Amino acid sequence: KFPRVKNWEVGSITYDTLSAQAQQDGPCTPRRCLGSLVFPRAPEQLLSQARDFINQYYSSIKRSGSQAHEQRLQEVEAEVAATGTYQLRESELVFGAKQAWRNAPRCVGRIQWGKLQVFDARDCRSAQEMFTYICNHIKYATNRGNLRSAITVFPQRCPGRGDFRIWNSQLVRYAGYRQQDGSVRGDPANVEITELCIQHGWTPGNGRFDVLPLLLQAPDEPPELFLLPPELVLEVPLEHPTLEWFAALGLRWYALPAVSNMLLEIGGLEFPAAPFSGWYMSTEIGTRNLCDPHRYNILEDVAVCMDLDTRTTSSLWKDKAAVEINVAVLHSYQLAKVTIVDHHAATASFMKHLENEQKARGGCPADWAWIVPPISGSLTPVFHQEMVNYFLSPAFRYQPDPW
Amino acid sequence: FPRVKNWEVGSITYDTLSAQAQQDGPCTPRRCLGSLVFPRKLAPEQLLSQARDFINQYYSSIKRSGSQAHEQRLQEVEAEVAATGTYQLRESELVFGAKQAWRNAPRCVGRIQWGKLQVFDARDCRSAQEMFTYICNHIKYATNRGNLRSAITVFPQRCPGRGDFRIWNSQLVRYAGYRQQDGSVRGDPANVEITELCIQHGWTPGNGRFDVLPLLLQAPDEPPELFLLPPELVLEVPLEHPTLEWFAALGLRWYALPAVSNMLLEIGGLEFPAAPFSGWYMSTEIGTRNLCDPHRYNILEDVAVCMDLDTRTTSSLWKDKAAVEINVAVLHSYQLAKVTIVDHHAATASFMKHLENEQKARGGCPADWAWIVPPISGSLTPVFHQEMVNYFLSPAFRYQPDPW
Numbered sequence: 129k130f131p132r133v134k135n136w137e138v139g140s141i142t143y144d145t146l147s148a149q150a151q152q153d154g155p156c157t158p159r160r161c162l163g164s165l166v167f168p169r170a171p172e173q174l175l176s177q178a179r180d181f182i183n184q185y186y187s188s189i190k191r192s193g194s195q196a197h198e199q200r201l202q203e204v205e206a207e208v209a210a211t212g213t214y215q216l217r218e219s220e221l222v223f224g225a226k227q228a229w230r231n232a233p234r235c236v237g238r239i240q241w242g243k244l245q246v247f248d249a250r251d252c253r254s255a256q257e258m259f260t261y262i263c264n265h266i267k268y269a270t271n272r273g274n275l276r277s278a279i280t281v282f283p284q285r286c287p288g289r290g291d292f293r294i295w296n297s298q299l300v301r302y303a304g305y306r307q308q309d310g311s312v313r314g315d316p317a318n319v320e321i322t323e324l325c326i327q328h329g330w331t332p333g334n335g336r337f338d339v340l341p342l343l344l345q346a347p348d349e350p351p352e353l354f355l356l357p358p359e360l361v362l363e364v365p366l367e368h369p370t371l372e373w374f375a376a377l378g379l380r381w382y383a384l385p386a387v388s389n390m391l392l393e394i395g396g397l398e399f400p401a402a403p404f405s406g407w408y409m410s411t412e413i414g415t416r417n418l419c420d421p422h423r424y425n426i427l428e429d430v431a432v433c434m435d436l437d438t439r440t441t442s443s444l445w446k447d448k449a450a451v452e453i454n455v456a457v458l459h460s461y462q463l464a465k466v467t468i469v470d471h472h473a474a475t476a477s478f479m480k481h482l483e484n485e486q487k488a489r490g491g492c493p494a495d496w497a498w499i500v501p502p503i504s505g506s507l508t509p510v511f512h513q514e515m516v517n518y519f520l521s522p523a524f525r526y527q528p529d530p531w
Numbered sequence: 532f533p534r535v536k537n538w539e540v541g542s543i544t545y546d547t548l549s550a551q552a553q554q555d556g557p558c559t560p561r562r563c564l565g566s567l568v569f570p571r572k573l574a575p576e577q578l579l580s581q582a583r584d585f586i587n588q589y590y591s592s593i594k595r596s597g598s599q600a601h602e603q604r605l606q607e608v609e610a611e612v613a614a615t616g617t618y619q620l621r622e623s624e625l626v627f628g629a630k631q632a633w634r635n636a637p638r639c640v641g642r643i644q645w646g647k648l649q650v651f652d653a654r655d656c657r658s659a660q661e662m663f664t665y666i667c668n669h670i671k672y673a674t675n676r677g678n679l680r681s682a683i684t685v686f687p688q689r690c691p692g693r694g695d696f697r698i699w700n701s702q703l704v705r706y707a708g709y710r711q712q713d714g715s716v717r718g719d720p721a722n723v724e725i726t727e728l729c730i731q732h733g734w735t736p737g738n739g740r741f742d743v744l745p746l747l748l749q750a751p752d753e754p755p756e757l758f759l760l761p762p763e764l765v766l767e768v769p770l771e772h773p774t775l776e777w778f779a780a781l782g783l784r785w786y787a788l789p790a791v792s793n794m795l796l797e798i799g800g801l802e803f804p805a806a807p808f809s810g811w812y813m814s815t816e817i818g819t820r821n822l823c824d825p826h827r828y829n830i831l832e833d834v835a836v837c838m839d840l841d842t843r844t845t846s847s848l849w850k851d852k853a854a855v856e857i858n859v860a861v862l863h864s865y866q867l868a869k870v871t872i873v874d875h876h877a878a879t880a881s882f883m884k885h886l887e888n889e890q891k892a893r894g895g896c897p898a899d900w901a902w903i904v905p906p907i908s909g910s911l912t913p914v915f916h917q918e919m920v921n922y923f924l925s926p927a928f929r930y931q932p933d934p935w
């Protein structure tokens with residue numbers, strides 16, 4: 129009844145009993161698997177989710193069945209009956225944010241899941257106070273290059289009030305200016321948000337690494353434009369340890385990966401605004417952000433400077449240029465004393481996580497196509513680890529763009 | 532109808548062919564098991580219905596459905612199973628079914644070639660010595676002095692009352708793997724079990740890292756018989772690097788012909804447990820998986836040391852630099868020997884074209900993203916950004932239990 133799961137490098141076999149507890153249904157059926165799709169997608173339903181969360185909390189602290197556990201269950205039942213909703217205790221919120229990270233199947237950094245700084249912003253009341261909370265987040269997490277994981281949780285969704293939203297997909301992003309040729313100067317992934325910042329009063333730049341302002345939405349108000357203080361956004365200029373012309377490319381990236389557009393769901397409550405941040409795995413910058421054809425797309429240019437034969441695929445110039453771009457990313461972050469992890473160290477620590485989670489809960493939801501790095505996949509141990517993908521709550525979820 | 536997006540281009544298609552998926556895969560709404568290598572698997576009315584669907588497939592594919600020839604073949608099969616318990620495929624039906632099974636293979640990136648397959652009909656095979664003759668002819672035709680040609684040879688269908696034909700080797704060409712005293716392995720670790728079966732059944736073992744194994748062939752209701760491949764039949768490529776002169780001295784080699792021999796072919800209810808097929812290699816199969824996997828030859832650190840890379844820290848990406856040069860050596864050595872090989876960039880681009888072609892021919896294409904995306908430089912190839920739908924159509928190649 130439980131999926132048998134094999135590691136082909138070592139030969140070992142486990143059974144994922146945790147998946148049987150999967151609380152929501154994914155896209156696959158016995159007739160066809162859709163595991164590679166990027167986006168696949170009251171009172172008594174709220175109560176059964178709340179009850180399950182409270183049960184999770186009290187088990188985490190090994191007080192299951194205690195008087196405090198029973199009373200907290202009764203307390204939540206009474207609040208949902210009177211108001212239609214309930215509030216999390218402070219400690220439940222911290223636990224819930226950590227559990228959501230721990231449950232995120234596509235995250236390879238979950239070895240860190242217990243070391244997460246939770247900022248409680250549930251009494252925020254304006255877009256301006258939102259901005260203050262975000263600046264304190266960026267300050268704490270950046271920590272002058274020594275990165276600390278963090279999440280800031282703004283007020284939960286509630287009836288009769290709009291949501292707090294952060295319109296930006298990340299707290300720090302580079303502008304992408306749509307050209308008349310159909311081309312883009314800057315980051316193409318950010319064309320729409322760039323157009324929305326301009327419409328809302330931002331005087332644009334014309335560089336390739338222009339940091340976008342924040343578009344912040346307080347309940348029942350249009351979004352408000354806030355500029356990030358430049359001394360708060362730590363950036364790394366890219367150079368290569370033995371290719372001195374690389375620095376003349378004029379490349380840079382920012383220190384802090386801070387996703388701001390997902391929804392955090394805890395015990396049936398929904399938090400549409402809850403930015404979270406850790407530190408980068410180098411292949412996200414080197415391979416994806418800089419070499420994706422639809423991103424900055426620098427691969428052919430680096431190869432030509434390296435004087436590779438770009439006229440035939442059989443020279444493996446693409447693989448060679450990509451490797452060196454990743455070397456430069458790693459070298460530049462270490463040189464700038466900004467935390468970063470390479471994809472070998474990251475996937476090694478994830479294997480340690482899988483073994484911890486197997487002992488702790490009997491399984492671990494993992495999306496194989498996202499845990500395997502985008503270069504060198506079979507060189508890392510997760511390639512040979514079979515994985516079971518499924519949805520647990522608390523959870524981080526994708527959500528529609530507020531516009 | 533699943534909506535499928537290419538994130539590099541922005542294009543959208545709908546896979547209407549998945550609707551016709553015969554059997555059921557491992558996944559449920561509760562959890563996805565698309566990364567498992569083997570799903571935990573391994574009546575006349577049952578046979579006729581599968582036979583019916585295939586005959587209809589065939590006649591539709593030659594624009595003769597509902598025709599006179601269609602209705603006659605249907606009634607012919609009904610009568611043959613009523614009298615025999617099974618039925619026989621027409622030679623053309625066998626060709627069509629073999630090509631379809633390849634075409635429907637979700638994990639094969641080489642399917643752009645699916646129409647060009649040489650089918651060798653061996654259904655009249657009697658002994659293991661005759662099996663060995665059919666095999667050696669396949670190998671010579673498929674190798675073709677290094678201008679590789681795709682091919683399959685079909686041995687007699689399993690039928691009730693008698694044991695099956697089986698090739699015990701997982702491939703026709705396999706290097707031995709010798710369990711060593713200090714726990715380790717000399718040779719290919721994947722083949723430790725078959726290498727000891729060969730020794731058990733008589734084979735005198737070598738002691739190299741690339742001793743080609745003999746073939747353990749099993750006729751119906753017989754013990755397996757050892758057969759030695761003639762050396763001039765097994766084309767091998769010694770591996771050298773275009774600029775690292777010391778690479779040749781590592782003594783690495785690989786063989787020209789990827790010929791899988793332990794999978795079962797299913798056509799319209801019929802099952803052929805011995806039907807070996809072959810194409811040519813993609814370079815990453817050799818250079819990345821077979822030589823660099825930790826549980827295979829595992830040569831990565833060896834090459835990195837010869838390159839004077841800093842193996843002390845993972846962030847020098849010495850594993851990545853060594854891997855790229857091993858794949859370069861593979862491509863260079865195959866091309867130099869004039870043996871057919873394709874790099875993962877060229878291959879993935881051809882599969883994109885196959886996806887487009889199948890979208891018009893059949894409305895979709897079953898594909899297993901985890902196996903289509905190459906094991907190095909995944910996101911540098913265009914299949915990485917292609918969403919894919921995996922399902923099982925028949926005719927098909929299937930995994931089967933080992934004969935022991």
Ligand code: HEM
Nearest residue numbers: 229232234235236237240277278404405406407408409524
């Ligand atoms: C501490 C260092 C961390 C590293 C190195 C890391 C690494 C990664 C990587 C490489 C991905 C794949 C993203 C992509 O390729 O697009 C990812 C996804 C993700 N990570 Fe982590 N992460 C870290 C911390 C965190 C934290 C602190 C959280 C939240 C508390 C988090 C939650 C997520 C989520 C929710 C996703 C994507 C989920 C989805 O798309 O469905 N991560 N992470």
Ligand code: HEM
Nearest residue numbers: 633636638639640641644681808809810811812813816928
């Ligand atoms: C002619 C050029 C061909 C190329 C370049 C090619 C390439 C590949 C590759 C890279 C795989 C992934 C297997 C792995 O490394 O794990 C594969 C799998 C497969 N191929 Fe193709 N192949 C070719 C021809 C063929 C032919 C002629 C057949 C049969 C008619 C075939 C049927 C299959 C099947 C059934 C699999 C699945 C193997 C498994 O999952 O066990 N292929 N192929």
Ligand SMILES: Cc1cc(N)nc2cc(-c3cccc(CN)c3)ccc12
Nearest residue numbers: 385386387404405406407408409412
């Ligand atoms: C916290 C954290 C650290 C890190 N190093 N990387 C991350 C990547 C994402 C991410 C999620 C979904 C989609 C995308 C863009 N494809 C990126 C989220 C959080 C991350």
Ligand SMILES: Cc1cc(N)nc2cc(-c3cccc(CN)c3)ccc12
Nearest residue numbers: 789790791808809810811812813816
């Ligand atoms: C025909 C053909 C051509 C080719 N180039 N490669 C192939 C690989 C396989 C294969 C089968 C089982 C396991 C693995 C490795 N996990 C690979 C089968 C047929 C192939």
Ligand SMILES: C[C@H](O)[C@H](O)[C@H]1CNc2nc(N)[nH]c(=O)c2N1
Nearest residue numbers: 164165497498538915916917918
């Ligand atoms: C089509 C494919 O699933 C999609 O492009 C995915 C594949 N795996 C990925 N894996 C990670 N970590 N990040 C990504 O953006 C993607 N893209």
Ligand SMILES: C[C@H](O)[C@H](O)[C@H]1CNc2nc(N)[nH]c(=O)c2N1
Nearest residue numbers: 511512513514566567568901902
């Ligand atoms: C666990 C995972 O499914 C397994 O390691 C797969 C992944 N993708 C693969 N892809 C190919 N071509 N060959 C393989 O052996 C594998 N192994």
Ligand SMILES: [Gd]
Nearest residue numbers: 369370371372
């Ligand atoms: Gd230099």
Ligand SMILES: [Gd]
Nearest residue numbers: 836837838839
């Ligand atoms: Gd030397």
Ligand SMILES: [Zn+2]
Nearest residue numbers: 156161558563
């Ligand atoms: Zn699935």
